[PDB]
């Protein structure tokens, strides 16, 4: 495979005929200093294509979907050039003849302030499995300055999602612990305080949330019981609102843990009780928007509601849910199509359930005027997909992002509220 020099690559940055491809993990791409480098993240302009994906049959379709074409001048890099070899070969097997390998990313590029790098601003909230393993193992890990933690396996009324296999020592939290199946909103401060204490969580506990994807099927009574990692990010939103100061989400959920080769447990870990949550609830009320404020936001050039629903929901063909009667949409919201239905987030995720390359999310959002200079309230049917979209924006450092918790459920439950239906 041909080589490209540091000075060459520097001189080509920002040319849209050269495509720089980072074959490290998405977590390293996002900013994690996985090998102790002094500066983490990716070469400015690079795209993420983890070499992990070479063993998935999806690999070539992913490359094409990311608009990487045989006529492009491709530059690969990783922590070492040897870690790019298989990727370079797979590119050449498929007719990509202009592929170079950059050998000097680590430590030459990472170690030199003069060479541009980008990262997900708040990447340390989105943790890799190696970090969780280090935490549970009591090993020295970056981006961690606490002495108290809990790993929590989220599910919706489905303890078998946890009992069938979970991260060692993790305890399970039913989403019903922190949200009401009546309002479908976060529970009251009194209920949240007791639920968090009864799961062993204080405001100063580092909480690591993850869930298990189990292929939600709309034929089933409770499809959300299979959307465990959306549920985990929903709980992360509620905990962050409530006032857990250090909340992490395992990137890609349970699949990232098993893909990393770590041990699986089926033990039913008994919960520890803490006497005091230790902070006022909610300590971050600005993260939640309720319906009166949502109506105000529809009337301002400064703010917008962001509808993270599926297309059949948006045009009012279906409600999206076997527990929501009305079909339709909130007038004036910006559509940010989630994916295929109320329980999938394909447009925000990779095929391995890790978050989609954040620049892609940002670019698609920008085309619809979903931009950080606005106060945005993300929502959906009842707040699950909205919370995952919100979390992605939070990770990018957007300063005024919220979840409009009530969503379409609360909106349509008031017959006085106007709605739209049909193709726009
Ligand atoms: Cl890596
Ligand atoms: Cl370095
Ligand atoms: Cl999921
Ligand atoms: Cl809507
Ligand atoms: Mg340290
Ligand atoms: Mg809600
Ligand atoms: Mg559900
Ligand atoms: Mg106890």
UniProtKB/TrEMBL annotation:
Please tell me where Zn(2+) 2 binds in this chain: 42, 118, 359
Binding sites annotated in the UniProt record for Mg(2+) 4: 273
Q: Which UniProt keywords apply?
A: Metal-binding, Repeat, Transferase, Zinc
Q: Which Gene3D superfamilies match?
A: Rhodanese-like domain
The answer, when asked if Zinc is one of the entry's keywords, is yes
Residues that the record marks as modified (Cysteine persulfide) are 380
Positions contributing to Zn(2+) 1 binding: 15, 18
User: Which branch of life, at top level?
Assistant: Bacteria
Instruction: Give residues annotated as binding Mg(2+) 3.
Output: 184-185, 382, 405
Q: Name all Rhodanese domain ranges.
A: 14-266, 308-420
Which positions does UniProt annotate for Mg(2+) 5 binding?
A: 297, 300, 303-304
Q: Which Pfam families match?
A: Rhodanese
Single annotated GO MF: thiosulfate-cyanide sulfurtransferase activity
Task: Provide the transmembrane region boundaries.
Answer: none
So where does Mg(2+) 2 get bound? 42, 118, 359
Q: Where does Mg(2+) 1 bind?
A: 15, 18
What is the name of the protein in this document?
Sulfurtransferase
């Amino acid at each position: 495979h041909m080589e490209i020099t540091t000075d060459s690559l520097l001189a080509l940055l920002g040319s849209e005929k050269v495509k720089i491809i980072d074959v490290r993990s998405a977590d390293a791409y996002n900013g994690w200093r996985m090998r102790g480098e002094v500066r983490g993240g990716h070469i400015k302009g690079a795209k993420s294509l983890p070499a992990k994906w070479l063993t998935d049959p999806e690999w070539l379709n992913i490359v094409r979907f990311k608009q990487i074409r045989p006529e492009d001048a491709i530059v690969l890099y990783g922590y070492t050039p040897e870690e790019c070899e298989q990727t370079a070969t797979r590119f050449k097997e498929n007719g990509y003849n202009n592929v170079s390998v950059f050998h000097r990313f680590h430590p030459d590029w990472t170690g030199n302030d003069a060479f541009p790098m980008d990262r997900l601003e708040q990447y340390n909230r989105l943790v890799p499995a190696e970090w969780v393993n280090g935490l549970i193992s009591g090993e020295e890990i970056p981006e961690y300055d606490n002495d108290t933690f809990i790993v929590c396996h989220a599910h919706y009324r489905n303890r078998d999602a946890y009992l069938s296999g979970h991260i060692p020592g993790a305890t399970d939290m039913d989403t019903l612990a922190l949200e009401s199946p009546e309002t479908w909103n976060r529970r009251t401060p009194e209920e949240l305080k007791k639920a968090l204490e009864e799961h062993g969580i204080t405001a100063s506990t580092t909480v690591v949330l993850y869930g298990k994807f189990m292929h939600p099927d709309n034929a089933d009574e409770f499809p959300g019981s299979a959307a465990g990692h959306i549920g985990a990010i929903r709980l992360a939103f509620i905990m962050m609102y409530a006032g857990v100061e250090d909340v992490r989400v395992l990137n890609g959920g349970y699949q990232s843990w098993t893909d990393a080769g770590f041990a699986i447990s089926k033990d039913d870990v008994p919960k520890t009780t803490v006497p005091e949550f230790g902070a006022p609830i909610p300590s971050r009320p600005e993260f939640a928007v309720d319906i009166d404020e949502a109506k105000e936001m529809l009337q301002s050039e400064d703010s917008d509601l962001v509808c993270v629903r599926s297309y059949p929901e948006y045009i009012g063909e279906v409600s999206g849910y076997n527990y929501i009667a009305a079909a339709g949409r909130i007038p004036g919201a910006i559509f940010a199509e989630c994916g295929s239905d109320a329980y999938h987030m394909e447009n925000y995720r990779n095929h391995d359930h890790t978050t989609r390359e954040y620049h892609e999310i940002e670019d698609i959002w920008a085309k619809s005027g979903i931009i950080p200079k606005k106060h945005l309230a993300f929502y959906c049917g009842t707040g699950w997909r909205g919370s995952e979209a919100w979390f992605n924006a939070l990770l990018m450092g957007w300063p005024r992002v919220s979840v409009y918790d009530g969503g379409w459920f609360e909106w349509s439950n008031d017959p006085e509220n106007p709605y739209e239906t049909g193709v726009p």
